[model samples]
Target chain A: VEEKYKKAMVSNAQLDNEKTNFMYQVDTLKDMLLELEEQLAESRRQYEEKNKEFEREKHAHSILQFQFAEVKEALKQREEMLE
Target chain B: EEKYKKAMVSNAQLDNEKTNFMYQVDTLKDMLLELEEQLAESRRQYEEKNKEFEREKHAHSILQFQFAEVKEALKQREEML
Candidate 1:
C-alpha cells in the first residue's frame, strides 16, 4: 500500500511539471504574438505617411505646372508684341 | 483521421495568413514605388521650371540695361548732329 501511494505521488509530481512547462510556453508565444502586432501597427503608420507625402508632391506639381504655363504664355505674348 | 483534420486546419490557416501577408506587402510595395516615382518627377519638373525662370529673369534684366544704353547714345548723337 505504501509503495502504491508513493508511485501515485510521483505521478502527480510529473504531471505538475508538464503543466508548468506548457504554461511557460504559452506565455512566451503570447509575448511573440504581441510583438508581431506592434510591428504590424508600425508598418501601417509608415505606409500612411508615405501616402501622404505622395499626395503632397502631386499637388505641388499641379500648382507648379499651372504657374509655369502662365509665365510661359505671358513671355511669348510679350515677344510677339515686341516683334 | 482526427489528428489529420486538425493538422489540416492549422496548415490551411497558416497558409492563408501567409498568403494574405505577402499580397498585402506586395501591394504596399507597388504603391510606395509609384509614390517615389511621382515625387521624383515632381522634383524634376520643379527644378526645371525654377531654372528657366531664373534664366529669363537674368536675361530680362540684361536687356533692360542694354536698352537704356542705346537710348542714351541715341539722344547724345541727336544733340551732336
Candidate 2:
C-alpha cells in the first residue's frame, strides 16, 4: 500500500539522521582521545626528566658536603699549628 | 507488491547501519573516558614530581652557599697561617 511505503520512507529518513549524528559524535570523540593520549605521553616524559634532574642535584649536594667536611678539618689543623 | 518489498528492504538496511553506528559511538565514548583518566593520572604524577624537584633544588642551593662560605673561611685561615 502507499501508506506502508510512505511510512518506510519517513522511517528511513529518521534513521539516516540518527546515523549521521552518531557518526559525527564518534569522530569527534576519537580526535579528543588522540590528543589526550599525546598529552599523557608528554607529561610522563617530563616527569621522568625531572626525576633525573633531582637525582643529579642531590648527588652534587653530597659532593659539596664532602668537600666542606675536608676543608673544615684542614682549617682546624692550620689554626692549631699557628696557635 | 515489488515496490513495497524494496522499500522494506531499504528500511531494514538503514536500521542495520543505524545500529552499527550506535555501537561505534558507544565504543568511542568508552575509549574517550579511559584516555581522560590516564591523562589525569599522568598530570598528577608530573605535578608531584615537580614539587619534589623544587624541594631538592632548594636544599642544594642552601648547601652550596654554606660550602662556599666554609671554603672562604678555610682559605683565609690558611693564608694567615
Candidate 3:
C-alpha cells in the first residue's frame, strides 16, 4: 500500500508538471494570437484607405482627360477662325 | 489511502485542464496562420492599387503639360491676330 501511495505521488507530480507547461504555452499562444489579430485588422484598414485613394486618383485622371479634350477642340476651332 | 485517492482526483483534473489548453493552443495557431494569410493578401492588394494609381498620376501629369502647351500656343496665336 505504501508503494502504491508513493507511485500515486509521483504520478501527481508528473501531472502537475505537465499542466504547468501546458498553461505556459497556452498563455504565450494567446498573446501571439492577440498580436496577430491586431496586425490583421490594421492591414485591412490600410488597404481600404489605399483603395479609396486610388478611386479618387482615377476620378481626377478622368476629369483631366475630358478637360484636355475640350481644350484641344477649342484650339482647333480658334485656329480655323483665324485662318 | 485517502491521500492517494485525493491526489488521483486532483491529477485527473489537472490532466483535463492540460488537455483543454492544448486544444486551445492548436486552435489559436490555426487562427494565426489564417490571419497572416489575410494580412498578406491585403498588403498585396494595396501595393497593386498603389502602382496603378501611380501610373494614372503619371499620365495625368503628361496630359496637363500637353494641355498647358497647347493653351499657351493658342494664346500667342490670338495675340498675333
Candidate 4:
C-alpha cells in the first residue's frame, strides 16, 4: 500500500509539471500567432497605400496623354504642310 | 486497512487530475486551431494586396515609358519642321 501511495504521489507531481508546461506552451503559441497576425495586417496596409498611389498616378497620366494627343495632331498638320 | 483506503483515495484523485488535464488539452487545441485560421486569413489578404500593388507599379512603369517615347517623337517632328 505504501508503495502504491508513493507511486501515485510521483504520478501526481509529474502531471502537475506537465500541466504547467502545457499551459506555458499555450501562452507562447498565442503570443506568436498574435504577432504573426499583426505583421500581416501591417503588410496589407502598406500595400493598400501603394495601390492608391498607383491609381492616382494612372489617373494623372491619362490626363497628360489627352493633352499630348492635341499636341501630336498639331505637329502632324505641320508635317503635312511640309510634305 | 488505513493504508489501503489512503491509496484508493490517492488513485481516485489522480484519475480526476488526468481527466482535467485531458480536458484542458482539448480546449487549448481548439483555441490554437482558431488562431491558425485567423493567421491564414491575414496572410491571404496581405498577399492579395501585394499583388495589386505590383500590378499598379507595372502600369506606372509602362505609362512612364510611353510618355517619354511620345515626348521624343514630338521633339523629332518639331525638328523636322
Candidate 5:
C-alpha cells in the first residue's frame, strides 16, 4: 500500500506556493507606491503654480490697499481744511 | 521505534508551521496595501496644505508692508508742519 506521507507532499507544495504568492503581492504594492508618488509629484507641480498665482495677487492687494488709504486720507484732510 | 515515530511527528509539525506562516503572510500582504494607500493620500493632502499656508502668509505680509508705508508717509507730512 502507498504510504499516507507520500500523498501529503501535494499539500506541502501548496503551502510553498501560497507563500510565494504573498511575496508577489508585496512586490506589487511596492510598485504601486512608486507610481502613486510620481503622480503626487505632478499634483505638487500644479499646486506650486497656484501658489505663484496667489503670490502675484497678494502683491496686487497691497497696491490696492495703499491706493485706498491715500484716497481716504486725502478726503479727510480736504474736509479738515475746509472747516 | 520511538526515534522513527518522533522524526515523523517532527516532519508533520514542520509542515503545519510552514502552512501557518504562509497564511500569516497573506494577511500581512493585504494589510500592507491598505497602509500604502492611506500613506499616499496623506502625503498629497499635506503638500497641498503647506502650499496654501505659504500663499496666505505672503498675502498677509504684503498687506502689512503697505499699511506701514502709508503710515510712515503720513507721519512725515505731519512732521513737516
Candidate 6:
C-alpha cells in the first residue's frame, strides 16, 4: 500500500507539472490573442478609411471628367468657328 | 489502504485538471490562428485599396493638367480673335 501511495504521488506530481506548463502556455496565447485582435482592429480601420477616401476621390474624378468634357466641347466649337 | 485510496483520488483530480487545461490551451491556439487569418485579410484589403486610390489620384491629376492646358488655349484663341 505504501508502494501504491508512492506511485500515485509520482503521477500526481507529473500531472501537476504538465498543468503548470499548460497554464503558462494559456497565458501566453491569451496575450498573443489580445495583441492580434488589436492589430486586426487597426487594420480594419485603415481599410475603412481608405475605402472612404477612394469613394471621395472617385466622385471628384467623375466631376472632373464631366468638366473636362464640357470644356473640350467648347474648344471644339471655338476652333470650328475659326475655321 | 485508505491512504493509498486517497492518494489515488488526488491523482485522478490532478489528471482531470490537466486535461481541462490541455483543452483550454488548444482552444486558445485555434482562436489565435483564426485571428491571425483575419488580420492578414484586413491588411491585404487595405493595401489593395491604397493602390487603387493612388491610381485614381494620378489619373485625376493628369486630367486636371489637361483641362488647364485646354482652357488656356481657349483663352489665347479668344484673345487672338
Question: Model 4 over residues B9-80: C-alpha lDDT tens digits?
Answer: 766766676677667667766766786686677667667766766676677677667667777877887787
lDDT of 2 at B52: 82
DockQ of candidate 3 (2 decimals): 0.68
CAPRI verdict (incorrect, acceptable, medium, high) for model 3:
medium
Taking the tens digit of each residue's C-alpha lDDT, what string does model 4 give over A1-83?
66867777776677667666766766776676677667657766766776677668668767766866776687678777879
Evaluated with TM-score, which candidate comes out highest? 6
> Which residue pairs overlap in candidate 5's backbone?
none
Residue range A1-83, candidate 1, lDDT tens digits: 55655555555555555555555655555565555556555655555555555555555555555655555555555556658
| DockQ order of candidates, top first | 6, 3, 2, 4, 5, 1
| Candidate 1 TM-score over all chains jointly | 0.43
Model 3 chain A, TM-score vs. native: 0.85
lDDT at A16 for candidate 4? 64
Candidate 1, which segments miss by more than 4 Å at Cα? A80-83, B1-81
Candidate 5: chain B TM-score against the reference chain B: 0.73
Clashes by residue pair, model 3: none
User: Mind giving the per-residue lDDT tens digits that candidate 2 earns over A1-83?
Assistant: 77878888888788878878877877887788788888988988988898898889878878887888888888788878879
Report how far residue A42 has shifted in candidate 3, in Å.
2.6
> Per-residue lDDT of B1-81 in model 3, one digit per residue for the tens?
778888788878988988998898899889878878888898888889889878978887888899889889778867776
User: Runs in model 3 with CA error above 4 Å?
Assistant: A81-83, B77-81
2 or 5: which has the higher lDDT?
2
Best by lDDT: 6
- Tens-place lDDT per residue, model 3, A1-83, is 79988988898888889988988998898898888778878888878887888889889889878977887887898878869
Candidate order by lDDT, decreasing, is 6, 3, 2, 4, 5, 1
Report the C-alpha lDDT of model 6 over A1-83, residue by residue, as the tens digit: 77878778898889889888988988898899999988998999999999999999999999989988998998898889979
Q: Report the C-alpha displacement of residue B75, candidate 1, in angstroms.
A: 27
Interface C-alpha RMSD per candidate, 1 decimal = 13.6, 2.1, 1.6, 4.6, 6.6, 1.7
> Which digits, one per residue and each the tens of the lDDT, describe model 2 over residues B1-81?
567887788888888888887888788888888887888888888888889889988988888888788889888986775
Report per-candidate DockQ. Answer: 0.03, 0.60, 0.68, 0.24, 0.12, 0.72
Which parts of model 2 have CA positions greater than 4 angstroms off?
A73-83, B77-81
Chain A, candidate 2, TM-score of 0.81
CA lDDT of A68 in candidate 1?
52
